[PDB]
């Protein structure tokens, strides 16, 4: 019985992913055992049977109080499988961690996502689809996408999409990033479900009122979806996507709730976007995760990725730690050559 030891709920999807890459098990307990009601939450629940699903030989185990978690790694599988995503936590929640396993399996990852499509704190389709998988691509991850078949806002959802990855690669390549990701240009989407297309475009209106000194194109999709294909519930987003021609992706996304002003909804958008632009190196925030485990996983050999002072926040910190204890490496920042505060992160790869 050896283990890596964590605890808390936090990056609760994201240390269950790592055990299953290194094939290290791990041990999860006190978690919120200092809260009104400790131990798992139904969605993490329904995440550990996610994961039995798409592999195979791994063994679960939940204290009877669920605070606490022991999970032994088996061989990321894939195949066919749908999966009934509980209301608490919208798609994203449960598609955004399988990104980390779908290229490195023995069958093509196709999975069937039913819930909710959105929410307030977890990544929208548009964000995986244009913000995440382009990032996959860089790395050697060929064919990957996600269908939209339903969209499904809460509360009711009733949404439904399609994950596919047809690359499989045994690991991402090496990674040569030093220079800041310039933006030449800025997309997105904007979408509103079983309403009048006059949301959608009123977001459009409020996100290109602060764009509008853009020296690049700025033009936004709009994707109004109606009958019932759209879902039960009413809905609206916007998902903003900055890029260059070397396929690098930054992005930011907000839904609105009933009363709600799309104008300063699509406003609140595109000020995220210039902030998390401001304060990238190579990627945003939101990416950091992915790439810096892509990194980690690639072949025996050293890899680097500009960032930038402010990307080096609490939540970094963690993940370093995180990785640190599953994996062993550590990272070594270097200052760069230019005449700004950004770092080159060093990572070696583990030799997947």
């Known amino acids: 019985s050896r283990y890596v030891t964590f605890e808390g709920s936090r990056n609760f999807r994201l240390r269950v992913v790592m055990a299953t890459l290194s094939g290290k098990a791990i041990k999860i307990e006190k978690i919120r055992s200092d809260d009104l009601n400790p131990g798992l939450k139904d969605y993490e629940v329904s995440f550990l049977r996610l994961m039995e699903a798409v592999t195979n030989g791994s063994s679960i185990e939940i204290s009877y109080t669920g605070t606490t978690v022991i999970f032994r790694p088996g061989i990321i599988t894939g195949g066919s499988y749908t999966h009934q995503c509980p209301n608490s936590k919208p798609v994203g929640y449960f598609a955004e961690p399988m990104l980390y396993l779908a290229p490195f399996s023995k069958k093509k990852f196709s999975i069937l ?40 806002s809460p509360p009711l959802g009733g949404g439904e999409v399609h994950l596919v990855v047809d690359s499989l690669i045994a690991q991402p390549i090496t990674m040569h990033a030093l220079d800041k990701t310039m933006i030449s240009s800025i997309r997105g989407v904007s979408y509103s479900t079983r309403v009048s297309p006059s949301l959608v475009n009123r977001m459009i209106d409020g996100a290109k009122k602060v764009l509008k000194s853009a ?74 995760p992915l790439t810096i485990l892509y990194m980690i996983i690639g072949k025996e050999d050293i890899g680097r990725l500009r960032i930038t002072k402010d990307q080096i926040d609490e939540r970094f910190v963690w993940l370093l730690r995180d990785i640190k204890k599953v994996f062993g490496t550590e990272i070594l920042l270097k200052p760069v050559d230019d005449n700004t505060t950004d770092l080159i992160a060093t990572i070696k790869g583990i030799g997947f």
């Open 113 to 152: 996502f039913r819930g909710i499509t959105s929410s307030h704190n977890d990544a929208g389709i548009d964000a995986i689809k244009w913000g995440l998988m382009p990032i996959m691509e860089k790395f050697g991850v060929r064919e990957c996408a996600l269908h939209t078949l339903k969209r499904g």
């Open 215 to 288: 020296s690049c194109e700025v033009n936004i999709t709009a994707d109004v979806w109606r009958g019932e294909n759209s879902g039960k519930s009413p809905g609206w987003g916007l998902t903003l996507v900055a890029e260059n021609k070397q396929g690098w992706r930054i992005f930011s996304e907000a839904i609105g709730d009933a009363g709600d002003v799309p104008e300063d909804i699509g406003a609140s958008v595109a000020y995220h976007l210039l902030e998390e632009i401001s304060k990238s190196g190579v990627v945003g925030r939101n990416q950091l």
